[PDB]
Design a protein around this ligand. Structure first.
Ligand SMILES: Nc1ccn([C@@H]2O[C@H](COP(=O)(O)OP(=O)(O)OCCOC(=O)c3ccccc3N)[C@@H](O)[C@H]2O)c(=O)n1
Ligand SMILES: Nc1ccn([C@@H]2O[C@H](COP(=O)(O)OP(=O)(O)OCCOC(=O)c3ccccc3N)[C@@H](O)[C@H]2O)c(=O)n1
Ligand SMILES: Nc1ccn([C@@H]2O[C@H](COP(=O)(O)OP(=O)(O)OCCOC(=O)c3ccccc3N)[C@@H](O)[C@H]2O)c(=O)n1
Ligand SMILES: CC(C)=CCC/C(C)=C/COP(=O)(O)OP(=O)(O)O
Ligand SMILES: [Zn+2]
Ligand SMILES: [Zn+2]
Ligand SMILES: [Zn+2]
Lengths: 156, 156, 156
């Protein structure tokens, strides 16, 4: 078995909905990256890549690589998973912690787990997603952005 | 085996001692929200539940449900642990990282480990608890709150 | 197998370079502690000690004790690893997440991996190091300090 950790942060900016764990949530602010800014999926991708000793999202999808520029986070996840599986890895389980003061993540989590399990080719039970606030403290608590932590266990 | 990740934050507020890992530690301020404010045990709870894909502490014990209203974090842990064991899981080991500038945790950690080991029905050697400051940086470093990280490895 | 989690933050201060994963990186600022301030190696050390249930880089090396005074983080890592192996543990794998806006960690990562692999006496494929920004948010995003998350898996 192999352990991986991922951490990601995206700042608010613009309007439109945000996308967390592949799920569109309505919010007064959008998430500025060039990513879609799926904090949950990027942190998960890093947790998975890190468990496979394949580096991170940046190493696999560099700015000077036209293939995945403008691709959504799920596409990046599936590709990362593809290269992880090519190395001989199977999915143990994943656990994702969304750190956000707002919006409320809870009702949207079931569909995140569905989306993640589809992309990783696994069951509901292998994917856990949870949310928490920083009790109005820090940059997350001041509503400046959303953080996310993810761990992943892989089998070879 | 299965991994989970817990992360909790509680702001400083009021008087009395703080409760960390079941241990009441003398401090100038208390810890606020809901239950006794045990960031250590809530994060530990979330990590264990996250490993069992049972969501989080807030999912088992919602705001609305009066059943768990007024219960301390050790009671919440033992109940969460009961739900986890009812799913067929046993404990591999746990690691808790208390993120606080003060107060000093180090004298109280041996006692934290004892309480946790009893609540999870495991050996002391299966329980690790540690502390780190953020070197006066962030909300923890400014003494605004205590963060807590936790990881758990379950067996099935 | 046993899980471990490490976390560390160090504030910027003085002149460069900074040392991250045993690698001196040119930067406008340095890192304050009376260590070399290696957040990566301290978080890794804590992750490993945590997995072994040996406490932390503080219980093992007291600030009061002048025995390990002036020691660099690689020496502390190797000593921690010696004591961990003395408990009968070997290395599964490690994953390290440097949380920093700057400097760019990417061209120094392979070196960190090599140093960590030599210090832990393991294969390079057993060591993963990654870096992430906080999108200019928090103390890391403002260039006040550097955080690091680490996870370890040990075998007995
Ligand atoms: N101190 C640092 C911080 C980061 N890095 C490298 O830059 C890369 C990008 O850093 P980031 O800004 O923290 O991560 P990212 O989420 O990529 O932020 C940019 C917006 O997101 C993306 O555009 C994106 C997301 C997933 C995959 C590819 C992407 N380009 C990291 O993956 C890492 O390899 C580095 O070398 N040194
Ligand atoms: N962005 C977010 C942030 C949080 N949440 C949900 O709200 C819950 C509480 O969020 P929090 O405000 O960050 O947690 P905290 O105050 O630390 O409280 C822990 C939750 O446990 C309880 O609610 C509880 C504890 C003891 C007795 C009764 C309780 N209801 C989370 O567990 C999560 O399910 C969410 O859905 N989206
Ligand atoms: N709330 C807390 C926070 C930390 N601690 C203990 O302090 C120790 C150190 O915590 P820290 O100060 O946050 O981490 P560290 O990176 O070790 O601090 C700076 C390192 O530079 C040094 O000062 C140093 C390091 C090694 C040997 C001598 C040194 N002077 C922890 O391992 C823990 O045992 C604690 O008991 N309670
Ligand atoms: C999500 C993680 C890894 C939390 C632990 C690190 C920490 C205590 C950051 C402080 O918050 P902050 O940087 O938001 O404080 P501020 O922005 O107020 O300086
Ligand atoms: Zn991202
Ligand atoms: Zn809590
Ligand atoms: Zn340190």
């Amino acid at each position: 078995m192999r352990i991986g950790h991922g951490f990601d942060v995206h700042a608010f900016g613009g309007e439109g909905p945000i996308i967390i764990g592949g799920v569109r949530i309505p919010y007064e602010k959008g998430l500025l990256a060039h990513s879609d800014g799926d904090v949950a999926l990027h942190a998960l991708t890093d947790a998975l890549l890190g468990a496979a000793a394949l580096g991170d999202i940046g190493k696999l999808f560099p700015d000077t690589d036209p293939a995945f520029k403008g691709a959504d986070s799920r596409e990046l996840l599936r590709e990362a998973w593809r290269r992880i599986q090519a190395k001989g890895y199977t999915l143990g389980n994943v656990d994702v912690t969304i750190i956000a003061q707002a919006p409320k993540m809870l009702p949207h989590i079931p569909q995140m787990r569905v989306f993640i399990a589809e992309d990783l080719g696994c069951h509901m039970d292998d994917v856990n997603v949870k949310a928490t606030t920083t009790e109005k403290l820090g940059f997350t608590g001041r509503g400046e952005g959303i953080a996310c932590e993810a761990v992943a266990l892989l089998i070879k």
